[PDB]
Write a protein that binds this DNA or RNA. Sequence first.
DNA 1: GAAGGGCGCCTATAAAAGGGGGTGGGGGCGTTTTTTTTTTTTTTTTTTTTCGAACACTCGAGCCGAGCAGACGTGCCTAC
Lengths: 165, 50, 222
Amino acid sequence: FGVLAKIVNYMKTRHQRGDTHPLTLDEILDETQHLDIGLKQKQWLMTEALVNNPKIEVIDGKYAFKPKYNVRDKKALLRLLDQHDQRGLGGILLEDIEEALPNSQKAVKALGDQILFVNRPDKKKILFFNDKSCQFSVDEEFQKLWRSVTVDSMDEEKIEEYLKR
Amino acid sequence: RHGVNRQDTGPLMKCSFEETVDVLMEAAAHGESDPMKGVSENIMLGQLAP
Amino acid sequence: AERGELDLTGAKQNTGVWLVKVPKYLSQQWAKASGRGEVGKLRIAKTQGRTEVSFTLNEDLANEHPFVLQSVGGQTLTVFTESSSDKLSLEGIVVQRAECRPAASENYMRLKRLQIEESSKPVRLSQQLDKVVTTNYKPVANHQYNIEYERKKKEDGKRARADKQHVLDMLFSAFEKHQYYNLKDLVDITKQPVVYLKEILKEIGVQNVKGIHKNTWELKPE
DNA sequence: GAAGGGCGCCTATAAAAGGGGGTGGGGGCGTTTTTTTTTTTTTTTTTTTTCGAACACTCGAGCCGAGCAGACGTGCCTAC
């Protein structure tokens, strides 16, 4: 299993590197320095780790792309967002950076266009999201706003009654 | 104790006898009015007793 | 299990035995004989409407105990044996009970009182103290503490961290034994700073907590 | 072996730089469980004169009303 994780980690780094080109098992053994893992483990790999693998990509007669399977478009979820009922997707910042290219470069331009950052995966952690209409009144705003939290203080159907009279 | 309290006398008299808090809680809760007509209420209040 | 079988030969032979009450002191005098032969002799004197039974000590071992018989009509008593060879046998049946009465009376008691001295005498409080201060015979460097420092004084306080890949090998080896482990077991197993190992567990794994902050980490098996 | 002597390390001061370690400071989870089957013990259990009712609650029970079914009475169809 540990050995298999080193295969996963290598593959992870290669995906991160930008490439998803498939390789033979032997090459992967070599590159992971696990060539002498023995016939038995190799066989376990062939008849479980490589075939019972729920998200292994077989292409060009070789095994590729293990870390990811859920997303391949590597672009903003324009389709997901367009919907008025199924809209959404708060996503991890590290997921977006891992998927293809680092967020920060696109983001600096994006920060006043399509992206919003909230501190939420811990205050150090960041989630990416987005916006739409303006603020209502120019003002100090925070001072007026803090005097406007309504009155979530009862007799309020009666405070509108009183207010109407 | 349980008989004197059935009397229709003012609440402050009944407090002066063993019931203390409990008769006052019920007196407050019903909202009864004490007419200061009797000896004890007047002495406790300090004005000249009748 | 034949070891659990009870031999009935004795019972079937109707073998009878006697049951006698005798003082620990009489049997202690008998213990000096150490089974070399006999401890003495028993005498039975019968008359017109009376039976007198007694035991008399060996003149040699000594270098009259009357017997009183008891009733056994309201109970049944038998003797069964327990061998060192793990075998049980009913060797025979108790047909009579009795008590050995001491011939000596009030002076015996002195012996008894001497005996009382033998059973009862560990000194109770007894001699007090006239001395006082001894304590705190100055360690200036506490004696256990010295030993612990000595243990420390054999190559401690430095860890691998530094050998990363070889440390990764230990992680991979450990993870082969079980799917999840406590942080404390990994600290024992890899002898490295915890915060660095945490950065590794962030790198190749996740964490899974339960109960009262009981946390186990795992390299996401799949 | 007991004892005195000789050799050598000890602590302080300094002062720096990298990294492991400790005592925090604060927050968390509020457990569940492993059992040791516990300090939560019997205060005094009472030494009793004890209620002293009042009030609430328990549980059962019996009269009474509606519905159902057969007997009694009425309504409807067939034959001379």
